[PDB]
């Protein structure tokens, strides 16, 4: 039965079309059709100044976006030699792991709701709501926040940010332990997920499945450990792993990821000493807002930086990072001009989707939904 | 019969349709997660009557264009709108849907009023869940005939009633 | 109906009309209360809107449902498309009269119930099959095989547990020896609360009632979240409303039968009020069931079928064999109290390992 | 450890080794030796094939060998059986009027989707592919978007009373071939790099 | 690619397009109604580019309510295109000053640009 | 693991008795941060002169290009801006606007600064181009809100509260946490 599990219907979150070649209640093979969200970042970004593109970057993966902001930022910093202040780096890892907790919350809520129960969507979402407030505190936006900058971050943290963060970091561990107490000793989910989702690590490696679904099959491969970028070299870290790749091990490993990310948030919070906020190089940083009325160089640099932008040298660059869905990176080709020559994005959810016909082959027809929720796609990342 | 032709009954049925607005989600992009968040346990569009959420299009009146409308999805969503009962309303959510948004290119429909008749426009990126509540209230009073535009006109109760389908 | 009188036919028609419109109001307001109780469960709060307490929102829902362009989809069977909701509603409304809400005359003079047939449980079984009938017929009529497979799932699973319903209802009949609910309830008045003797079979009855789309197989299915269900996805204005109405009436009739048959249909040992205790037990089971509605996953109808067929039914027929031994030799009835207490202790203490 | 042996192998055969002072390595193989060399590369222990990035240099200020250029990324995961962590790139130019390339789908299944994208976005047809079908762009879309001679295809912005904007006529930012708004751009707007 | 019709003569443009259309089957063709100012259709002016794949057809800005009988001629035009089996309808939004020079660019450039900028449309907005 | 069903039931019940968590917009004022991205406001100096000098630095740095600025030369008798230049026409298409803060960040005079209104839902594209006199700090409410208050005769109440308004919003009058 080549059944048309269409785009967005029935409840294929992240609009995606499926031709399930399938007779009965088994699953022979699923033929996917994507592109239903193709908006054109790789092309539009070729007509926007480097400063502007920070407005285009978070909106690709709208759940874990600061990884996109950080990947783009770091690649350009390397390309033009920018300096990360220690406080800016600590703040960037704070926002990185916190957006990772938020993306993880949304992923498990969607997975539970996609087939099964509705209740635990809200509780996790409750915490997510709190997290958003924290972001709205510093960036003034829930998500899609345009805060990061090439040198560092836009402006400083408010007085009210840190105590709220402490409140949420003190309440969260019990909350995550509660989710794991509910789910890990699974009543029916045990008979639903432990068997399903055949993930042989060999083919997961062969098809490009980096997004935390591979270490659920027992592969210790994380960019934070393999390629430390934002100071992760300097963190006490437990690296989650799975015994055998299924949906159950995936979800449990991601929950342990959330706890380790909360621990990293606290750890970074403690080591925070006042200081600067962004790379002071005037060629790369606009003049501070106060001496716009004293210095000529200030006005000229502000005018230029905010009409033209800046010109990094000619060259190609690329640096990878670890998002809630795996290895991510921007291939930046710059021709020495105010607008990037090309930006090619390694979309983890894009190739992580090759393992759809494979994983759900021979599995159930309903379980084709649970195995998609467990694959954690963000079709803003795939379609792009 | 269109909910008209009685001084009492048209008020009654407009009351009914306006308060019992049953949204038909079409989750497309990051606007759609701000549409989902309008139902959680802090700010829920689960009060005016929108508790239940008919995923099938044969059963829901409000279709919210929630996210960037990539062209390869334009016709499908079109038929999703044509797969709706006739007493149906469409809200255009976000900047990517209302206008072309910031993505001004070959991949995006630069105004979703092209493919579907829009009832209410709601800017924002994404429009705050509370702006979505304000828009559903806008549409609430619009379908009662309690809506006036800047130019001084009262607006029809149901948009997509004035289009020669084809 | 050995001892029970008969009201005139016009009173039968009047009371049936009362039951139908009361079931309308009841299912509307129970949809409200379930929304609000789920809200209390999942923190969020309910619609303090159009009501205050929501009690004008069913009106908005019903007014929306009508005028909604009741459409007859082309490529669909002209006849069954229209006919199946009426079947699903008719064969849901009836089978509510037999449930006794009091001793005769406690309707302020005439009759608490509607009909008191000699063979009741068979009547319930027969009209219960017809709900699955309307389900899968509507699935076929829609002309969408996506709903056909959902209808087939519904019918298969519901039919498996529907077979199990017979092995459940056998057990108390051996004890009482009558198939009229009033005699059974009066027996439960004498010795007390029939489930005390037959708790295991009681279980497999209760769980069987869960398979009838109540919740937790939840692979009826509904169009949501899975291979879309049948009897919907093609009906717009009232026929979908009729499906929802009949399915909820079946829900509340089953949740009322569960206390009526095994537990104490109103007939309280003390304070003996006709209606209020029945309504309170209905609400008790409803609240536990809503707890379940909020708190548990699906079953995927493969494990559901295996569980019903291999696990529920052999266990139920085993209990039937034990109870039939006891009744045929008739030595005590207390031995059944002892055995059911031991069985519950086993089925409970085996949990906390 | 294996990256050093990759360099010793390729430099011995005279293939240019591209390196920026940032820590990323490019290895350009010719068309013929491409397939066999990269097969040997996978045999050399390269578990992971990360990216296939297609490039159009039509409007690049400095001239380049060929217009289109496809870059694959070969990696060996550090936490797997015997993982050095060796990751590197392979660039292979493809002529303007000869958009050919043999696939490595048979070696890594990851090139199933990725190469299709480069066939979707660029005019590059991948040889030996199981299915070369348009992935992202609409089925009726004519052309290959990401090549510079293909329009971005913008729509004006709208205002009250005849007041409009044509963004491509509005942009103050300069590309590489844009001479600038003055007679020219020199100094720090022709390329600037801080010395840490 | 042919250019039939004339600016600001809706009825003559419509009759010449009637004649030049003939019995041409539009099952896989594309109709691009090019205009300016997305939102305001009450005062809109329209061009048409018909991309059949085997030869293409041009109509200058002569339809729409901005001209006397452009609204009725555009309604008849969309009805005519729909009668012949057209399903894929598009709208292009250009700057007013473009509309004039876009009919004088070579066919490949004009047509490429139009196909890249096209918006799927519901013909009900023109009927 | 039958115990897990019971544990799930028990925790769901415990939350059942836990009544509070929600905020009921519009009946309860939405708690916003002082840095929130809302409707733009044009601020004025103490002299009353407007801060905007019509320099179109907001429009160029806009990734959607939604900002329109026609300039003009001040009249020495009754000047509008501080310098020799003011903004005759200042339009922002909220259907193009993506709420970055790039116009706020690039404004050298501090004139254009985002406010807090989100209640700008309207029916018509052509009406969602908010103009100069549609964003001044002096104005209290959004376009549909002001039209409703006019066709209704009932004054405007914004449905949000913030702990305080920023110093960049000098003159921005709004409800502050309940001080009034
Ligand atoms: C699922 O996650 C996601 O969704 C979407 C789209 C689809 C969608 C579906 C449903 C079913 C919402 C829904 C939720 C709850 C209810 N309810 O009644 O509770 C009703 C409807 C909403 O956005 C996108 C785009 C996404 O990228 C991710 C990760
Ligand atoms: S308006 Fe913003 S939030 Fe909404 S779809 Fe567009 S980019 Fe996403
Ligand atoms: S906030 Fe951004 S999109 Fe909005 S007007 Fe300012 S610069 Fe443009
Ligand atoms: S708002 Fe500010 S940036 Fe824009 S033109 Fe006025 S003074 Fe310049």
Question: 3-state DSSP helix/strand/coil percent for chain E, to nearest 5?
Answer: 35, 25, 40
Count helices and strands in chain D by DSSP H and E runs: 4, 9
Partner residues linked to D89 by β-bridges? D26, D73
Domains, chain B, in order of start with CATH, read: 1-160 (3.40.50.12280)
What gap in Å lies between CA C266 and CA C277, rounded to an integer? 5
- Ligand 3: residue of F58, F61, F66 to mutate (most ligand atoms within 8 A of CB) is F66
CA distance A34 to chain B (A): 9
Based on the number of CB atoms within 10 Å of its own CB, is D196 exposed (0-12), middle (13-18) or buried (19 or more)? exposed
Q: What angle do CA C194, C198, C199 make, to 5 degrees?
A: 100
The gap from C-alpha C104 to its chain's centroid, in whole angstroms, comes to: 24
> Ligand 4 centroid vs A311 CA: distance in angstroms?
25
What gap in Å lies between CA B100 and CA A40, rounded to an integer? 12
Which contiguous run of DSSP H or E holds residue A330?
Answer: strand A326-335
* Sign of the CA dihedral with C46 first, then C52, C54, and C60 last: negative
**Residues near A130 by beta carbon (within 8 Å), at least 6 away in sequence:** A168
What gap in Å lies between CA C30 and CA C19, rounded to an integer? 15
Which contiguous run of DSSP H or E holds residue C202?
Answer: helix C195-211
> Ligand 1 centroid vs A379 CA: distance in angstroms?
12
Cα D91 to Cα B114, C250, D16, D28, D35: the distances in Å are: 43, 67, 10, 5, 12
Structure tokens at A28: 């022979």
Q: Which 8-state DSSP code applies to residue A312?
A: P
Residue C50 phi, psi dihedral angles, 5° rounding: -35, -5
* Furthest C-alpha separation in chain F: 85
**Residues near D78 by beta carbon (within 8 Å), at least 6 away in sequence:** A220, A221, A225, A226, D84, D85
Q: Which chain F residue shows the shortest CA-CA distance from C216?
A: F5
Cβ-based contacts of A56 with chain B (< 8 Å): 102
Cβ-based contacts of C234 with chain B (< 8 Å): 58
Subunits close to E (at least 3 CB pairs below 8 A): B, D, F
Beta carbons within 10 angstroms of residue A102's beta carbon? 27
Structural Rg of chain B based on CA atoms: 15
The gap from C-alpha A156 to its chain's centroid, in whole angstroms, comes to: 23
> With contact defined as beta carbons under 8 Å apart, do A324 and A255 qualify?
no
> With contact defined as beta carbons under 8 Å apart, do C162 and C309 qualify?
no
In short, whether F107's Cβ falls inside 6 Å of ligand 4 is: yes
What gap in Å lies between CA C36 and CA C164, rounded to an integer? 33
The residue assigned the tokens 């900028």 is: E117
The tally of CA atoms less than 13 A away on the side-chain side of residue A238 is 14
CB contact under 8 A, F61 and A307: yes
What gap in Å lies between CA A132 and CA A130, rounded to an integer? 5
3-state secondary structure of F33: coil
The residue assigned the tokens 């069903």 is: F5
Residue C255 phi, psi dihedral angles, 5° rounding: -65, -20
Are 3 or more Cβ–Cβ pairs between E and C shorter than 8 Å?
no
- Ligand 1: residue of A13, A109, A128, A211 to mutate (most ligand atoms within 8 A of CB) is A13
Cα D46 to Cα A205, B103, D2, D84: the distances in Å are: 10, 38, 9, 10
Q: Is the peptide bond before C253 cis (omega within 30 degrees of 0)?
A: no
Residue B90 in marked binding region? no
Q: Which 8-state DSSP code applies to residue A329?
A: E
In short, whether F162's Cβ falls inside 6 Å of ligand 4 is: no
Angle between helices C145-176 and C313-329 (to 10 degrees): 20
> With contact defined as beta carbons under 8 Å apart, do F49 and F81 qualify?
yes
Residues of B with CB under 8 A from a CB of A: 26-30, 33-34, 37, 40-42, 55, 67-68, 70-73, 76, 80, 96, 102-108, 125-126, 128
What gap in Å lies between CA C178 and CA C101, rounded to an integer? 19
What gap in Å lies between CA F83 and CA C30, rounded to an integer? 69
Ligand 2: nearest atom to the Cα of B67 = 5
CB contact under 8 A, F124 and E38: no
Structure tokens at C234: 């093609």
The gap from C-alpha B68 to its chain's centroid, in whole angstroms, comes to: 15
Which DSSP string do the residues of chain B spell out, in sequence order?
A: -TT-S-TTHHHHHHHHHHHT--EEEEE-SHHHHHHHTTBSSSSBS-SSS-SS---SGGG-SEEEEES--BGGGHHHHHHHHHTS-SS-EEEEESHHHHS-TT--SSSB-S-GGGTS--SEEE-SSSPPHHHHHHHHHHHHHHHTT--B-TTSPBPPS-TTSSS---
What gap in Å lies between CA C291 and CA C16, rounded to an integer? 31
Structure tokens at A155: 């402006």
> Ligand 1 centroid vs B35 CA: distance in angstroms?
8
Count helices and strands in chain C by DSSP H and E runs: 12, 0
Q: Edge-to-edge strand order for the sheet containing F85-93? A: F67-73, F85-93, F129-130
Pairing type for strands D48-56 and D68-75 reads antiparallel
3-state secondary structure of F76: coil
In short, whether F111's Cβ falls inside 6 Å of ligand 4 is: yes
CA distance B24 to chain D (A): 25
> With contact defined as beta carbons under 8 Å apart, do C70 and C97 qualify?
no
Cα dihedral D170, D172, D174, D179, rounded to 10, equals 90
> With contact defined as beta carbons under 8 Å apart, do D69 and D99 qualify?
no
3-state secondary structure of A229: coil
Domains, chain A, in order of start with CATH, read: 2-383 (1.10.645.10)
The gap from C-alpha B18 to its chain's centroid, in whole angstroms, comes to: 12
Q: Which of B47, B99, B149 sits opposite F93 (nearest CB)?
A: B99
Cα dihedral C124, C126, C131, C132, rounded to 10, equals 130
CA distance A49 to chain D (A): 6
> With contact defined as beta carbons under 8 Å apart, do A245 and A74 qualify?
no
* Furthest C-alpha separation in chain C: 65
Ligand nearest to the CA of F101: 3
**Residues near A176 by beta carbon (within 8 Å), at least 6 away in sequence:** A255, A258, A259, A262
Q: Which of A43, A201, A346 sits opposite D51 (nearest CB)?
A: A346
Among A39, E114, F122, residue whose Cα is nearest residue B102: A39
Among E91, A111, F4, residue whose Cα is nearest residue B110: E91
In short, whether F42's Cβ falls inside 6 Å of ligand 3 is: no
> With contact defined as beta carbons under 8 Å apart, do F131 and D160 qualify?
yes
> With contact defined as beta carbons under 8 Å apart, do B21 and B49 qualify?
yes
Three-state SS sequence of C20-82: HHHHHHHHHHHHHHHHHHHHHHCCCCCCCCECCECCCHHHHHHHHHCCCCCCCCCCCCHHHHH
- Ligand 3: residue of F62, F96, F117 to mutate (most ligand atoms within 8 A of CB) is F62
Q: Which of C48, C350, C351 sits opposite F6 (nearest CB)?
A: C351
Which DSSP string do the residues of D25-39 spell out, in sequence order?
A: EEEE--HHHHHHHHH
| Length of chain C counted residue by residue | 353
Q: Which of C43, C146, C300 sits opposite A366 (nearest CB)?
A: C300
Are 3 or more Cβ–Cβ pairs between A and E shorter than 8 Å?
no
Ligand nearest to the CA of A61: 1
- Which residues of F line the annotated binding site for [4Fe-4S] cluster? 52, 55-56, 58, 62, 97-98, 100, 103, 107
Residue A71 phi, psi dihedral angles, 5° rounding: -65, -50
Q: Is the peptide bond before A10 cis (omega within 30 degrees of 0)?
A: yes
Beta carbons within 10 angstroms of residue A126's beta carbon? 20
CB contact under 8 A, E38 and F125: yes
3-state secondary structure of D7: helix
Among C110, C66, C89, C19, residue whose Cα is nearest residue C237: C66
Which DSSP string do the residues of A105-166 spell out, in sequence order?
A: HHHHHHHHHHSS-STHHHHHHHHHHHHHHHHHHHTSSSSS---B-SSSBSSPPPTTHHHHHH
What gap in Å lies between CA A19 and CA A29, rounded to an integer? 9
Q: Classify the phi-psi angles of F141: left when phi > 0, otherwise alpha if psi is within -120 to 50, otherwise beta.
A: left
Cα C76 to Cα C71, C85, C141, C142, F26: the distances in Å are: 11, 15, 6, 5, 45
CB contact under 8 A, A283 and D188: yes
Structure tokens at C155: 């019918």
Check CB contact of F4 with chain A, cutoff 8 Å. Answer: yes
Check CB contact of D176 with chain E, cutoff 8 Å. Answer: no
3-state secondary structure of F32: coil
Among D154, D147, D99, D153, residue whose Cα is nearest residue D127: D99
Q: What is the domain partition of chain D in residue ranges? A: 1-196
3-state secondary structure of C217: coil
3-state secondary structure of E127: coil
What gap in Å lies between CA E98 and CA C255, rounded to an integer? 71
What gap in Å lies between CA B58 and CA B52, rounded to an integer? 14
The tally of CA atoms less than 13 A away on the side-chain side of residue D124 is 28
> With contact defined as beta carbons under 8 Å apart, do B42 and B108 qualify?
no
**Residues near D62 by beta carbon (within 8 Å), at least 6 away in sequence:** A314, A335
> With contact defined as beta carbons under 8 Å apart, do B117 and B160 qualify?
yes
Ligand nearest to the CA of B64: 1
Based on the number of CB atoms within 10 Å of its own CB, is C13 exposed (0-12), middle (13-18) or buried (19 or more)? exposed
Cα B152 to Cα B121, B155, C18, C40, F158: the distances in Å are: 18, 9, 51, 44, 23
Check CB contact of D24 with chain B, cutoff 8 Å. Answer: no
What gap in Å lies between CA D53 and CA D117, rounded to an integer? 9
Which contiguous run of DSSP H or E holds residue C187?
Answer: helix C181-187
Q: Which of F65, F91, F93 sits opposite D167 (nearest CB)?
A: F65
> With contact defined as beta carbons under 8 Å apart, do D157 and D167 qualify?
yes
Structure tokens at A369: 């939904």
What gap in Å lies between CA D151 and CA E112, rounded to an integer? 8
Beta carbons within 10 angstroms of residue D194's beta carbon? 12
**Residues near A41 by beta carbon (within 8 Å), at least 6 away in sequence:** A56, A59, A60, A343, A345, A384
Experimental method for this entry? X-ray
Which contiguous run of DSSP H or E holds residue A333?
Answer: strand A326-335
What gap in Å lies between CA A87 and CA A277, rounded to an integer? 7
Check CB contact of F64 with chain B, cutoff 8 Å. Answer: yes
3-state secondary structure of C288: helix
Q: Which of residues 121-140 of F touch E (CB under 8 A)?
A: 124-126
> With contact defined as beta carbons under 8 Å apart, do D164 and D155 qualify?
no
> With contact defined as beta carbons under 8 Å apart, do C323 and C177 qualify?
no
* Sign of the CA dihedral with A344 first, then A350, A352, and A358 last: negative
> Ligand 3 centroid vs B124 CA: distance in angstroms?
11
Q: Which 8-state DSSP code applies to residue C191?
A: I
In short, whether B39's Cβ falls inside 6 Å of ligand 1 is: yes
Cβ-based contacts of D175 with chain A (< 8 Å): 335, 337-339, 341
Among C184, C236, C205, C284, residue whose Cα is nearest residue C73: C236
Q: How many CB pairs under 8 A join A and B?
A: 86
Pairing type for strands F129-130 and F160-161 reads unpaired
Q: Is the peptide bond before C115 cis (omega within 30 degrees of 0)?
A: no
CB contact under 8 A, C240 and B87: no
* Sign of the CA dihedral with B28 first, then B34, B35, and B39 last: positive
| Resolution value (Å, 1 decimal) | 3.4
> With contact defined as beta carbons under 8 Å apart, do A179 and A322 qualify?
no
| Length of chain E counted residue by residue | 127
Q: Which 8-state DSSP code applies to residue A287?
A: P
Subunits close to D (at least 3 CB pairs below 8 A): A, B, E, F
Structure tokens at A172: 């969260």
Q: Which 8-state DSSP code applies to residue C186?
A: H
What gap in Å lies between CA B92 and CA B77, rounded to an integer? 13
What gap in Å lies between CA C51 and CA C78, rounded to an integer? 39
Cβ-based contacts of D108 with chain A (< 8 Å): 206-208
> With contact defined as beta carbons under 8 Å apart, do C339 and C195 qualify?
no
What gap in Å lies between CA F114 and CA F108, rounded to an integer? 14
**Residues near B85 by beta carbon (within 8 Å), at least 6 away in sequence:** B58, B59, B61, C68, C69, C71, C236, C237
Structure tokens at A201: 């690590």
Question: If you take atom 21 of ligand 1, which residue's CA is the nearest one?
Answer: B53
What gap in Å lies between CA A135 and CA A143, rounded to an integer? 7
What gap in Å lies between CA A319 and CA A329, rounded to an integer? 6
Cβ-based contacts of E122 with chain B (< 8 Å): 78, 114-117, 163
What gap in Å lies between CA F121 and CA D79, rounded to an integer? 52
């Amino acid at each position: 039965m080549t059944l048309n599990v269409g785009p967005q219907h029935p409840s294929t979150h992240g609009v995606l079309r499926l031709m399930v070649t399938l007779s009965g209640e088994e699953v022979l093979e699923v033929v996917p059709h994507i592109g239903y969200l193709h908006t054109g970042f790789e092309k539009t970004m070729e007509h926007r100044t480097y400063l502007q593109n920070i407005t285009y970057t978070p909106r690709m993966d709208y759940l874990h976006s600061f990884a996109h902001d950080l990947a783009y930022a770091l690649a350009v910093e390397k390309l033009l030699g920018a300096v990360v202040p220690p406080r800016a780096e600590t703040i960037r890892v704070i926002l990185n792991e916190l957006s990772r907790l938020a993306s993880h919350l949304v992923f498990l809520g969607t997975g539970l709701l996609d087939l099964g129960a509705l209740t635990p969507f809200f509780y996790a979402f409750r915490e997510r709501e709190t997290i958003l407030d924290l972001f709205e505190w510093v960036t003034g936006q829930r998500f899609h926040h345009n805060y990061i900058r090439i040198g560092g971050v836009k402006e400083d943290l408010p007085e009210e940010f840190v105590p709220e963060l402490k409140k949420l970091l003190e309440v969260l561990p019990h909350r995550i332990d509660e989710y794991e107490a509910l789910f890990a000793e699974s009543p029916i989910f045990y008979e639903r997920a432990r068997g399903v989702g055949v993930i042989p690590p060999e083919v997961a490696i062969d098809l490009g499945l980096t997004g935390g679904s591979l270490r659920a099959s027992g592969v210790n491969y994380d960019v934070r450990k393999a390629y430390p970028y934002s100071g992760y070299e300097t963190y006490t870290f437990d690296v989650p792993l799975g015994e055998r790749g299924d949906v159950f091990d995936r979800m449990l490993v991601r929950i342990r990821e959330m706890r380790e990310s909360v621990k990293i948030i606290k750890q970074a919070l403690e080591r925070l000493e006042p200081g600067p906020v962004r790379d002071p190089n005037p060629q790369i940083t606009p003049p501070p807002r106060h001496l716009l009325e004293t210095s000529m160089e200030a006005v000229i640099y502000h005018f230029k930086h905010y009409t033209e932008g800046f010109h990094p040298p000619k060259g190609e660059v690329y640096v990878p990072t670890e998002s809630a869905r795996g290895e991510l990176g921007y291939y930046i080709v710059s021709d020495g001009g105010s607008m990037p020559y090309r930006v090619k994005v390694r979309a983890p959810s894009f190739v992580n989707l090759q393992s759809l016909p494979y994983a759900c082959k021979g599995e159930q027809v309903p379980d084709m939904v649970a195995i998609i929720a467990s694959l954690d796609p963000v079709m803003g990342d795939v379609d792009r | 019969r269109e909910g008209i032709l009685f001084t009492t009954l048209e008020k009654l049925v407009a009351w009914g349709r306006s308060n019992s607005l049953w949204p038909a989600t079409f989750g497309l992009a990051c606007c759609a997660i701000e549409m989902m968040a309008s139902t959680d346990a802090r700010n829920d569009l689960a009060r005016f009557g929108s508790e239940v959420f008919r995923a099938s299009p044969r059963q829901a009146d409000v279709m919210i264009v929630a996210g960037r409308l990539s062209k390869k999805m334009a016709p499908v969503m079109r038929r999703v709108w044509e797969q709706m009962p006739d007493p149906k309303w469409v809200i255009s959510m976000g900047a990517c849907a209302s206008s072309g948004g910031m993505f001004n290119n070959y991949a995006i429909v630069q105004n979703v009023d092209s493919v579907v008749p829009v009832d209410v426009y709601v800017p924002g990126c994404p429009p705050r869940p509370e702006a979505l509540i304000y828009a559903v209230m806008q549409l609430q009073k619009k379908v009662r005939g309690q809506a006036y535009n800047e130019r001084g006109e009262r607006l029809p109760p149901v948009a997509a009633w004035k289009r020669t389908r084809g | 109906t050995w001892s029970y009188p008969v009201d005139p036919y016009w009173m039968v028609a009047l009371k049936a009309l009362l039951v139908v419109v009361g079931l309308l109001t009841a299912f509307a307001f129970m949809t409200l209360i379930e929304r609000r109780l789920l809200a209390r469960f999942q923190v969020r709060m309910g619609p303090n809107r159009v009501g205050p307490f929501g009690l004008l929102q069913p009106l908005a829902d019903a007014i929306k449902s009508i005028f909604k362009e009741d459409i007859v989809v082309a490529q669909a069977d002209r006849f069954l498309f229209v006919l199946a909701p009426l079947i699903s509603v008719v064969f849901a409304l009836l089978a509510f009269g037999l449930i006794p809400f009091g001793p005769p005359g406690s309707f302020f003079g005439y009759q608490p119930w509607v009909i008191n047939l000699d063979l009741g449980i068979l009547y319930l079984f027969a009209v219960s099959e017809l709900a699955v009938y309307g389900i899968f017929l509507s699935g076929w009529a829609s002309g969408s095989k996506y709903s056909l497979l959902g209808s087939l799932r519904s019918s298969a699973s519901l039919i498996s547990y529907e077979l199990g319903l017979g092995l459940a209802l056998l057990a108390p009949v051996l004890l009482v020896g009558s198939l009229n609910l009033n005699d059974i309830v009066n027996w439960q008045k004498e010795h007390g609360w029939l489930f005390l003797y037959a708790f295991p079979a009681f279980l497999v009855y209760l769980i069987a009632s869960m398979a009838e789309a109540a919740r937790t197989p939840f692979d009826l299915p509904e169009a949501e979240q899975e291979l879309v269900g049948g009897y919907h996805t093609e009906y717009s204005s009232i026929k979908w409303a009729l499906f929802q109405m009949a399915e909820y009436i079946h829900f509340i009739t089953a949740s009322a039968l569960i206390p009526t048959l095994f537990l104490g249909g109103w007939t309280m040992p003390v304070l003996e009020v006709p209606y209020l205790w029945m309504f309170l037990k209905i609400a008790f089971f409803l609240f536990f069931f809503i707890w379940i509605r909020a708190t548990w996953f699906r079953l995927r109808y493969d494990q559901l079928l295996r569980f019903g067929w291999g696990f529920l039914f052999p266990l139920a027929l085993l209990w039937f064999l034990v109870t039939a031994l006891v009744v045929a030799l008739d030595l005590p009835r207390t031995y059944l109290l002892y055995l059911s207490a031991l069985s519950f202790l086993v089925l409970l203490g085996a949990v906390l390992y | 450890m294996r990256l050093e042996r990759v360099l010793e192998e390729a430099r011995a055969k005279g293939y240019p080794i591209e390196d920026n002072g940032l820590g990323n390595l490019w290895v350009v193989l010719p068309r013929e030796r491409f397939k066999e060399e990269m097969a040997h590369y996978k045999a050399m222990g390269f578990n992971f094939l990360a990216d296939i990035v297609g490039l159009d240099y039509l409007t690049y200020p400095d001239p380049r060998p060929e217009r289109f250029a496809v870059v694959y990324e070969l990696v060996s995961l550090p936490g797997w059986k015997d993982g050095d962590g060796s990751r590197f790139f392979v660039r292979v130019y493809v002529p303007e009027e000869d958009p050919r390339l043999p696939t490595v789908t048979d070696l890594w299944g990851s090139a199933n989707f990725l190469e299709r994208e480069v066939y979707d976005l660029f005019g590059i047809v991948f040889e030996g592919h199981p299915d070369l079908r348009k992935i992202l762009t609409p089925e009726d879309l004519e052309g290959h978007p990401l090549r510079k001679d293909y329009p971005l295809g913008e729509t004006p912005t709208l205002f009250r009373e005849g007041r409009y904007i044509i963004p491509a006529e509005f942009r103050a930012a300069l590309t590489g071939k844009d001479p600038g708004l003055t007679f020219y751009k020199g100094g720090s707007r022709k390329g600037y790099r801080s010395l840490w | 690619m042919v250019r039939v019709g004339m600016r600001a003569a809706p009825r003559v443009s419509l009759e010449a397009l009637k004649a030049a259309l003939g019995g041409l089957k539009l099952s896989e063709a594309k109709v691009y109604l090019i205009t300016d100012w997305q939102d305001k259709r009450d005062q809109a002016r329209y061009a048409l580019l018909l991309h059949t794949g085997k030869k293409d057809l041009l109509v200058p800005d002569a339809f729409g309510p901005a001209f006397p009988g452009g609204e009725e001629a555009l309604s008849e035009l969309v009805g005519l295109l729909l009668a012949q089996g057209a399903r894929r309808f598009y709208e292009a939004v250009v700057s007013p000053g473009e509309m004039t020079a876009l009919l004088d660019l070579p066919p490949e450039e004009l047509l490429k640009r139009v196909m890249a900028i096209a918006n799927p449309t519901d013909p009900g907005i023109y009927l | 693991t039958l115990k897990a069903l019971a544990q799930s039931l028990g925790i769901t019940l415990k939350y059942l008795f836990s009544k509070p968590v929600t905020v009921p917009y519009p009946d309860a004022p939405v708690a916003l941060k002082p840095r929130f991205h809302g409707r733009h406001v044009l601020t004025r100096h103490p002299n009353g002169l407007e801060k905007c000098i019509g320099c179109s630095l907001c429009a160029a740095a806009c990734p959607a290009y939604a900002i329109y600025v026609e300039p003009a030369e001040n009249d020495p008798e009754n000047p509008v801006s501080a310098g020799e230049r003011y903004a005759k026409v200042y339009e922002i298409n909220m259907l193009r606007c993506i709420f970055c803060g790039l116009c706020e960040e690039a404004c050298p005079t501090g004139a254009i600064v985002l406010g807090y209104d989100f209640e700008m839902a309207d029916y018509e594209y052509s009406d969602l181009v908010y103009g100069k006199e549609d964003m001044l700090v002096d104005v209290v409410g959004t376009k549909p809100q002001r039209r409703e208050a006019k066709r209704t005769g009932k004054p405007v109440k914004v449905g949000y509260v913030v702990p305080y308004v920023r110093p960049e919003l000098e003159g921005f009058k709004a409800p502050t946490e309940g001080g009034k």
